[PDB]
């Protein structure tokens, strides 16, 4: 469940981190 | 759950016959968001009607503002007609400058 949103969140975590 | 739209029709400026004005039709409290809104002059669809982006309130129900330029006269009637899945028939509300 929520495969793409989970992929999305993991993709953009570093962008928001820095 | 389905929610039936409420319709309010009002002018931007004090109505004066022969003076250009704007007529607003504010449609609220509806769900689902799919809706057809027409503004009418003497029962005929007005072609140039601008719509706001649909939005929703704290209670989750949707709202939208339709508006059109109009010049009131003694004899012309204006209305807002709404089609929505919550209602078997379209709902029409007439502009009344007195109310």
């Amino acid at each position: 469940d929520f495969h793409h949103i989970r992929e999305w969140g993991n993709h953009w975590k570093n962008f928001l981190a820095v | 759950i389905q929610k039936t739209p409420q319709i309010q029709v009002y002018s931007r400026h004090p109505p004066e016959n022969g003076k250009p004005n704007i007529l607003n039709c504010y449609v609220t409290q509806f769900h689902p968001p799919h809706i057809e809104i027409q503004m009418l002059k003497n029962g005929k669809k007005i072609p140039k009607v601008e719509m706001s982006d649909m939005s929703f309130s704290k209670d989750w129900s949707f709202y939208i503002l339709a508006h059109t330029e109009f010049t009131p006269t003694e004899t012309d009637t204006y209305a807002c007609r709404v089609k929505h899945a919550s209602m078997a028939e379209p709902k029409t509300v007439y502009w009344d400058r007195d109310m």
Binding site: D1, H4, I5 | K3, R12, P14, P33, W60
Partner: protein, 265 residues
């Protein structure tokens, strides 16, 4: 003044092959952004809608949300696979005070079902039990949890502080009400109507009066929007025939510099 920043997403799913997602963003009662399904790009509805963010920063945030929107759509369609039509709404943003509180609420078929709170997604009491498993699975992904936490705890209130600075002259604008009186019959009685239009900001005082005596029959309507980012309001009074004489509508508003509008019936 406290401002509530709201990002509103409206997603409709008619069947397996048809969906649309549209978003709007509000700061208080002023719309700052729109994002149509048909547009690849988020549209600014103010000169100051980028806030204090750089062009590169905005380009990437836009890209991030572009992937969110596609990802969201795919996941819901797959959740349905594992009854149409389906309506989902999300309301996310922050209330400003220099403190703030963020929120992220989700509604399914017009009813509030889920929020993000602290570090996790939570179903609200009385939400359908079929949500529990999907939400448990969503909470297992720490990356998205962190992403949402950074978005709410940091990215939101920082963005909003910048919007408040860049949009000051619009946020603090004063537009004067114009008022007019009319009436209609109400019984075997008359209803007098005081219309007040074109004012901004929203707070206003409207009352029927006999000299200095407030008429407690005054019935204030809802605040209705004009299309030019001003407000409209009417206040009515049911009056017996012959008691119309000596009535006035009085309007107080911040734009008027202490000089109330008074119209006499």
């Amino acid at each position: 003044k406290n401002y509530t920043f709201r990002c509103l997403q409206m997603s409709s799913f008619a069947n397996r092959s048809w969906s649309r997602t549209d978003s709007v963003v509000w700061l208080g009662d002023l719309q700052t952004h729109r994002w149509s399904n048909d547009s690849a790009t988020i549209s600014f509805t103010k000169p100051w809608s980028q806030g204090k963010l750089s062009n590169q920063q905005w380009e990437k945030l836009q890209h991030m949300f572009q992937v969110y929107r596609v990802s969201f759509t795919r996941d819901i369609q797959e959740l349905v696979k594992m009854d149409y039509p389906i309506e989902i709404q999300l309301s996310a943003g922050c209330e400003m005070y220099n403190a703030s509180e963020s929120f992220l609420h989700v509604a399914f078929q017009g009813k509030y079902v889920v929020r993000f709170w602290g570090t996790s997604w939570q179903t609200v009491p009385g939400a359908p039990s079929w949500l529990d498993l999907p939400i448990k699975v969503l909470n297992a992904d720490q990356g998205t949890s962190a992403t949402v936490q950074m978005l709410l705890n940091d990215t939101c209130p920082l963005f909003v502080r910048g919007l408040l600075e860049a949009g000051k002259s619009d946020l603090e604008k004063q537009e004067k009400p114009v008022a007019w009186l009319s009436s209609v019959p109400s019984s075997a009685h008359r209803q007098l109507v005081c219309h007040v239009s074109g004012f901004y900001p929203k707070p206003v005082w409207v009352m029927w009066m006999r000299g200095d005596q407030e008429q407690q029959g005054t019935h204030r309507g809802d605040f209705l929007p004009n299309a030019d980012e001003t407000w409209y309001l009417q206040a009515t009074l049911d009056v017996e025939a012959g008691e119309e004489a000596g009535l006035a509508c009085r309007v107080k508003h911040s734009s008027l510099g202490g000089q109330d509008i008074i119209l006499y019936w």
